[PDB]
Ligand binder design. Structure first.
Ligand SMILES: Cc1cn([C@H]2C[C@H](OP(=O)(O)O)[C@@H](COP(=O)(O)O)O2)c(=O)[nH]c1=O
Ligand SMILES: [Ca+2]
Length: 129
């Protein structure tokens, strides 16, 4: 896989963000995770966590996996990086997302994110408390 440049347009919630990619606005949905919706427990915290991560970043990148790059809602499906740190992994490590939506061919970082979930769980963090 390889990282490509993108620019923040707007935070949306824990696992979606609006980014300018190859000069076009698109909503990106974070691969391999699921944050609570804003109306659910930890949802506001998930939203706040991702917002700080992307808004503070001097550099956002997106990394597509090997399979589909758009979901059925027209959202980009990627791993999203903020100054080199993967949002997807960071959410999971903080117990603010579960590993989820693991589809064949788009699962390159599955074991990485699983390892993070295991540690969040060990630490009884947030969703796991
Ligand atoms: C993360 C992801 C979600 N989706 C689809 C599955 C779910 O369809 P359904 O909407 O029909 O339940 C939806 C969940 O995304 P959200 O968790 O943002 O709601 O997005 C994909 O198709 N591929 C993906 O990689
Ligand atoms: Ca969600």
């Amino acid at each position: 896989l390889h990282k490509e440049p993108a620019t923040l347009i707007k935070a949306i919630d824990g696992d979606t963000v609006k980014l300018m990619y190859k000069g076009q606005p698109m909503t990106f949905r974070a691969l391999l995770v699921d944050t609570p919706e804003f109306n659910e427990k930890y949802g506001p915290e998930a939203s706040a966590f991702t917002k700080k991560m992307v808004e503070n970043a001097k550099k956002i990148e997106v990394e597509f996996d090997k399979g589909q790059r758009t979901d059925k809602y027209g959202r980009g499906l990627a791993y999203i990086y903020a100054d080199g740190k993967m949002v997807n992994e960071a959410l999971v490590r903080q117990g603010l997302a579960k590993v989820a939506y693991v589809y064949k061919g788009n699962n390159t970082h599955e074991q990485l994110l699983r390892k993070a979930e295991a540690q969040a769980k060990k630490e009884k963090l947030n969703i796991w408390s």
